[PDB]
From a paper:
In this study, SgfSL has been used as a model system to determine the transport tunnels connecting the TNC with surface. The structures of SgfSL, and its mutant forms with sufficient occupancy of copper ions, were obtained via the cultivation of the corresponding over-producer, the E. coli strain, in a medium with a high concentration of copper(II) sulfate (1 mM); in the case of cultivation with 0.25 mM CuSO4, the laccase crystal structures were deprived of copper. Using program Caver, we calculated one T3 tunnel (we referred to it as T3α) closely approaching the TNC. The side chain of Ile170 significantly narrowed this tunnel. The second tunnel (T3β) emerged upon rotation on the side chain of His165, which closed the shortest route from the protein surface to the cavity between Cu3α and Cu3β. In all the available structures of 2D laccases, the histidine is observed in a “closed” conformation and width of the proposed tunnel is 0.71 ± 0.09 Å. We suggest that “open” and “closed” states of the proposed T3β tunnel are provided by the mobility of the imidazole ring His165. Based on our results, we propose that mobile positively charged side chain of histidine 165 acts as a “gate” in the tunnel that transports oxygen molecules to T2/T3 center.
Residue numbers in the entry:
A (entry chain C): 41 to 317
B (entry chain B): 41 to 320
C (entry chain A): 40 to 317
């Protein structure tokens, strides 16, 4: 259960599609757009060619954090990488391994928890597209990274989680002992503090300490702002057991207004003690 | 001194009580609540049973960050771990040491600068209870950790420090060369940036670089938001001498509105150079 | 090219606080050449800097620094009587130190890092007006052996402006593909921000560069910052992405919409920027 070495050339089709109630989402197949968009996963060294199509009546773009791209796949109107209504375009993302440069220094690799979003809808910074749902996660794995049993994306988009109505989660289910990966992206105007009851993670790339010499803070509450992204893997219920473990923004008015969800951790027999919605 | 190995079963009585000025606070003995609440110190591996009593006319709870607890000690109304008016309940916190798992991976230990607070007063997230002063620090030490000469707790609670009126500190005294530990917790609605004149610390677990290979950034200014907690140790006046050293939130309107205090570092003879209280 | 040498040199410099146009105020190293941000101060761990300070303004001003070692008498605060009356002069003394093992066996952190100085008395006793007006500037303290850049650029998010510039007027910064560029990022004022750069990423540690394969620091292209935060990093301009007009901006959506945007203009070796229309 470990990521291999990257270096594969990959292609994928992506669509921008209008969704109900003024929303917009990215999808891998027509009519399957979602908010957040599909989880794109690569190994360091992989190339991704996204054959992009804009099914909408307004221009859209695709912009990505962290990964290597040339200025033609900027996803910006300034560098003419947006997609007119009905248009098509191939965005190219590349990734690289860490390595020692010629100058002696250490080149950082592409691995990490990243994301993509629109850059042209509403404003030339994608303010309207991000608000409508044009955002999604990208995970770039380093060779040897432990692979999880499940991955869940939580996006604090302004006062919402994944553009959902207040006090509607989302909820995620796991069994005690599962290796669960959380991808956490923030968008919009507000800062947040992400908090998980009964679980904690390392404030580093993978969310797990590398070993006894990793000085990274171990936290259960992280401040984050627009376009921040981080991730972590936890063992569900580790040292704490089954239950309906709350997660929420800890800004007090934000959790009061419904930026809350449940990490529903079950015993092997499928039971969650005390849970009563 | 250094922190020893944990693994002891500890017991403590805690009370939630109404305090003067429409506030609420935790204490270890009845009639002795405080804001911030009492400092709790544990060694990785210790277990803590908190014999809790609610002396108030409203439900209250005890919820902790960082430490291990089963869901029955979650301290939320959502699964019946709150304490009714006049009720009692034992909460149990555990802690563990770091080590390796069967799957080859490293499990981080409980050590850190943590905190406890209410979760049911006002809202199902404790907004009223936190605002009223139901919060306190929890320190979990790892074996070998350097012990301080003194520990001081600074909570940025909305626009107050430790719920105090504007421009009323608190101030903390030390002697030059003392090893002083600061526990910094934030609560409420607003982000802040904690800044200390004349001192700096590492942005890691303990606030001190482990040694020459520790890449952690060394800072004197840290942004923090609701329920953030961190801590550090500094040598009072190290390389800067005695004096009235300001700490404050560096958000400009927050300092201008009184989120300011003094770290009063004394010379051995007790005096503080240039410290005219009236000019502060 | 080069690495930082060991420190330990006692340096002196004159500094002036001057009014600038548009009600602004700035620090400078020579009379009549004040700037916003103020001049870049660079030191090697162990150096001392005596700032021979002159307030040429009609209101009091001060000089307060982050991170470096200073005695209470160089606090730069009215509260500790180290401000400078109109027309007055004062010598501020900053010191730095290398890291080392203390007698008690613990490790003393060095002064090295990305720091800043600013006023502490104009407008309020916390310098709110001075900072608003532009009295801020960067300080870099290098550790022996630190990689030296080809150029250094200072970006300050001061309330809703970058370096007190009007909305949407940069600043822009030019480099050639392959250049080692150092960014100093400071934030001031009332608001939090998130600094983001297209096409480039860095390490969230002291230097912005991973020390090697065992450095666990996170690699980021987006960082939340708040008033008086400072961090810095070095990047290889266009590394793995090529030339072009690469945006940097605050990623708070209404902040980029209302002018907190700039361009990192990475040129080809022939000096051209593909697809860049000014
Ligand atoms: Cu952008
Ligand atoms: Cu929030
Ligand atoms: Cu919690
Ligand atoms: Cu972005
Ligand atoms: Cu909670
Ligand atoms: Cu504040
Ligand atoms: Cu300061
Ligand atoms: Cu909490
Ligand atoms: Cu200050
Ligand atoms: Cu901003
Ligand atoms: Cu970008
Ligand atoms: Cu400052």
């Amino acid at each position: 259960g470990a990521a291999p070495a990257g270096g594969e050339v990959r292609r994928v089709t992506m669509y921008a599609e209008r969704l109900a109630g003024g929303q917009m989402g990215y999808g891998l197949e027509k009519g399957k757009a979602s908010i957040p968009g599909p989880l794109i996963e690569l190994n360091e060294g992989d190339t991704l060619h996204v054959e992009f199509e804009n099914t909408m009546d307004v221009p859209v773009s695709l912009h990505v954090h962290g990964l290597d791209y040339e200025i033609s796949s900027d996803g910006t109107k300034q560098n003419k990488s947006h997609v007119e209504p009905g248009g098509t375009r191939t965005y190219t993302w590349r990734t690289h391994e860490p390595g020692r440069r010629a100058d002696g220094t250490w080149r950082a690799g592409s691995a990490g928890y990243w994301h993509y979003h629109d850059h042209v809808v509403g404003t030339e910074h994608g303010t309207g597209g991000i608000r409508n749902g044009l955002y999604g996660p990208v995970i770039v794995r380093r060779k040897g990274d432990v692979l999880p049993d499940a991955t869940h994306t939580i996006v604090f988009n302004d006062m919402t989680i994944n553009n959902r109505p207040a006090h509607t989660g989302p909820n995620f289910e796991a069994t005690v002992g599962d290796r669960v990966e959380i991808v956490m992206i923030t968008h919009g105007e507000y800062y947040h503090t992400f908090h998980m009851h009964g679980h904690r993670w390392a404030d580093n790339r993978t969310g797990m300490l590398t070993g006894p010499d990793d000085p990274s803070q171990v936290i259960d509450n992280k401040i984050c702002g627009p376009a921040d992204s981080f991730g972590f893997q936890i063992i569900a219920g580790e040292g704490v057991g089954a239950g309906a473990w709350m997660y929420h923004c800890h800004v007090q008015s934000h959790s009061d207004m419904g930026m809350v969800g449940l990490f529903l951790v079950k015993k092997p027999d499928g039971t969650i003690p005390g849970y009563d919605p």
